[PDB]
Design a protein around this ligand. Structure first.
Ligand SMILES: COC(=O)[C@@H](C(=O)Nc1cnccc1C)c1cccc(Cl)c1
Ligand SMILES: COC(=O)[C@@H](C(=O)Nc1cnccc1C)c1cccc(Cl)c1
Lengths: 304, 304
């Protein structure tokens, strides 16, 4: 019992972190096999960041300008290429600590762990969600660029995020491991609209199931609703519309608890319309949306 | 910017986890140098747990009855001893992945990361506080016993907690790495009073400083208070009395923000007396007490 915002164990990712320096800029890189991946803005100076012509800036760099250090050992750079907003530095040595891995592009609403790093050194690990507006609400300071987000399935690490920047609003933006930004963002120091965010409805419902499983049940009521009625409420409260695909993903939790998905929707509708009346659910005084239905099943069943 | 409930990177601890089996019971062990540490209740059957005579139960066991497996490799047990509520199994091989480590007994109100494990395999990592009543509000299921809590300072892991049991109330109890329980708990399947818990005042104040640093400032007011006046409020709301030792520990945050500790106490007094009025601080609708002043400084400065 108990339910916590749990991150994946970070060991397999810690073994991949390196420091990349180009000129006077230092950030983190991810060393997998004989390639180091890092944000392409490592080649910029502060004056370049306002409107960088990355193609021109990269042309002024050679393999020997990219200093890559894995703890104490220096890596020899034998090639460099830019792919979208990431740089790929080919090195002469395969990382002996490379776990089994994949590069994935996650969907908005999905969750992942972030290993926050500075100067190639891990500082902490936390779990978060990719917001529906393709931002993440992380904890990142200057020097954290290149820190990565990932999920683990048994012995396979699926890397899904590389950190690039903080928007003027204090939220975070980054790319998949092919260097494609999540959302409309560009890697320039310009104010950029993130666009309307919404609460991840299917995740709130999964977390209400986790609450029932752990004994927080005060919010269960004698009501039911329909997908149509619930979605009118979701619209009013800036929640994502619930679909049959979301109801299907909640099947395991509905089966485990015996609470029909539309009955849990009626509990969520009442919580949206009335608030929590000074009460808490799983130690929270707000409706939590950073746990997917898969996260709830994994945590509630102790998957390793 | 951004502030998250961040755990230490778990890699150094992952390399120490093993599975320990004795008879039909399987739990986690911690392999450091040539010793494996685990909860002594690995020697119990279900019938023993109601009132175990651990001395008698252990006398029926020999070195070859303790099966210790580090992933795929089997460890050879050459000695066993019980120290308080932990068993120490001497093995013939030093763990090659033993980090620099210490065993520490943490104080109530201090925080640490937990690497939740099942069958010697890591499942997740989360940060928590040792409550003032010496319980922890973790996320643990059957088989998680032997999972450990720790802090990291550069390359040194200070182990402070080993998980033993879940109280009938769903909260958790465990020991230091010498097998001494935190709190009044005994390793028996009997209902046990945890005693009155309180909110960790110095941690709430540290988190309010973290909020100001990250731009959540709506709770700052034109008021001040004294330690005496604040402590009358703390008493009414079941908060730990604030001492000059706590004010001293908050010195760095007070210096960084220019907000005197007693002025932040007046903000906290107003939040206790009026609530949050439907607003949030650092994404929370309640006053958070799982960040120490050291945690806030570390996270806000990006220590690795
Ligand atoms: C001058 O460079 C910066 O401030 C970084 C950035 O956001 N770093 C940064 C990242 N995360 C947290 C805090 C900080 C500070 C920057 C800005 C704009 C565009 C890009 Cl691709 C990069
Ligand atoms: C029958 O044994 C148990 O249930 C364990 C225990 O709390 N495990 C356990 C631990 N954490 C979460 C869930 C579970 C289930 C037990 C009970 C009482 C005393 C001790 Cl020292 C151990």
């Amino acid at each position: 019992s108990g339910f916590r915002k749990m991150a994946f164990p970070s060991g397999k990712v810690e073994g991949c972190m390196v420091q990349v320096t180009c000129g006077t800029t230092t950030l983190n890189g991810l060393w997998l096999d004989d390639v180091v991946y890092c944000p392409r803005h490592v080649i910029c100076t502060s004056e370049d960041m306002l409107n960088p012509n990355y193609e021109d800036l990269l042309i002024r760099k050679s393999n020997h300008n990219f200093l890559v250090q894995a703890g104490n050992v220096q890596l020899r750079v034998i090639g460099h290429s830019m792919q979208n907003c990431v740089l790929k530095l080919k090195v002469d040595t395969a990382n002996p600590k490379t776990p089994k891995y994949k590069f994935v592009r996650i969907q908005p609403g999905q969750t992942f762990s972030v290993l926050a790093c500075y100067n190639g050194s891990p500082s902490g690990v936390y779990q978060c969600a990719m917001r529906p507006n393709f931002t993440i609400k992380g904890s990142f300071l200057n020097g954290s660029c290149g820190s990565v987000g990932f999920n683990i399935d048994y012995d396979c690490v699926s890397f899904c995020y590389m950190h690039h920047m903080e928007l003027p609003t204090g939220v975070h933006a980054g790319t998949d491991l092919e260097g494609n930004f999540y959302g409309p963002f560009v890697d320039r120091q310009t104010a950029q609209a993130a666009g309307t965010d919404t609460t991840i409805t299917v995740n709130v419902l999964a977390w209400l199931y986790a609450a029932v499983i752990n004994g927080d049940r005060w919010f269960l009521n004698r009501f039911t609703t329909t997908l149509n009625d619930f979605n009118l409420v979701a619209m009013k409260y800036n929640y994502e519309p619930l679909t049959q695909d979301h109801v299907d993903i909640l099947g395991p939790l509905s089966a485990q608890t015996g609470i029909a998905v539309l009955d849990m929707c009626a509990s969520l509708k009442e919580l949206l319309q009335n608030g929590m009346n000074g009460r808490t659910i799983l130690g929270s005084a707000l409706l939590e949306d950073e746990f997917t239905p898969f996260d709830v099943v994994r945590q509630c069943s102790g998957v390793t």
